[PDB]
């Protein structure tokens, strides 16, 4: 029920409230590019990107049972350790996993925030799998959005 899940820090209501607040405060999630990787029998990996902002969101969602993921074989240029922004198990928020071995349980999702300047929609090997509506760049100097991409 609603009343008991407001006092539970691991409840489904608290993850929904953290996901919808993150969606409202981040330009990457409500406006940015959607670049998906290749298909897999277990997991779904995609990125949210915007040109001008120098960080990306990496969403990793396991829809099979428990598996191990090597994220170095999907996205190039990743560090040895990545910090978790949001997880479907709320105890693992702000922790650090290693990129070569990520243990995903059955029904686990992870959101990584990665500071980089190499976006996938600018690489021609990934341009066929990237999508936008209302295309715009971001100028960090002026704090505006502009269309002259």
């Amino acid at each position: 029920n609603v009343d008991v899940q407001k006092t539970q820090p691991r409840s489904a209501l608290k993850l929904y409230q953290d996901l919808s607040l993150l969606h409202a405060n981040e330009l990457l999630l409500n406006r940015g590019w959607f670049c998906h990787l290749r298909n897999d029998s277990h997991y779904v990996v995609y990125t949210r990107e915007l040109d001008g902002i120098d960080r990306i969101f990496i969403v990793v969602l396991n829809f099979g049972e428990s598996t191990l993921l090597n994220l170095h074989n999907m996205i190039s240029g990743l560090p040895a350790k990545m910090r978790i922004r949001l997880s479907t198990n709320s105890a693992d928020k702000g922790s650090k996993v290693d990129t070569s071995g990520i243990f995903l349980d059955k029904g686990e999702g992870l959101i990584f925030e990665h500071n980089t300047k190499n976006l996938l929609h600018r690489q021609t090997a990934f341009r066929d799998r990237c999508f936008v509506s209302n295309r715009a760049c971001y100028s960090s100097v002026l704090n505006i959005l502009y269309t002259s991409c």
Binding site: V44, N62, F63, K106, G107, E108, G109, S133
Partner: protein, 100 residues
């Protein structure tokens, strides 16, 4: 209960206006979930809708089975994470944020 190429006709033409989006229930029609079947729903909407249009996503509704009874208790959190990280507008049926 429609093919994907007939649903995207409600988006309209680049010079004729129509609905802002047609409602997308293709994730509500999944009775079992997998990595290939979720990839097939997401990529078929993004490839078939016209460029520059706005997508939307639903995982339930009053005519669908509820999510924790359709897929299991372990998929409540990961389908809410899928709904809020996909591009477009997420649509939430009442009680899905709790897990009814």
């Amino acid at each position: 209960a429609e093919s994907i190429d007939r649903t995207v006709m409600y988006y309209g033409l680049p010079f004729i206006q129509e609905a802002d989006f047609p409602f997308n229930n293709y994730l509500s029609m999944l009775d079992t979930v997998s990595g290939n079947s979720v990839y097939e729903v997401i990529t078929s909407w993004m490839e078939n809708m016209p460029e520059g249009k706005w997508p939307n996503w639903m995982i339930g509704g009053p005519d669908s089975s509820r999510l924790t009874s359709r897929l299991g208790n372990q998929y409540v959190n990961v389908m809410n994470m899928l709904l809020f990280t996909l591009p477009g507008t997420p649509i939430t049926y009442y009680g899905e944020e709790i897990g009814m």
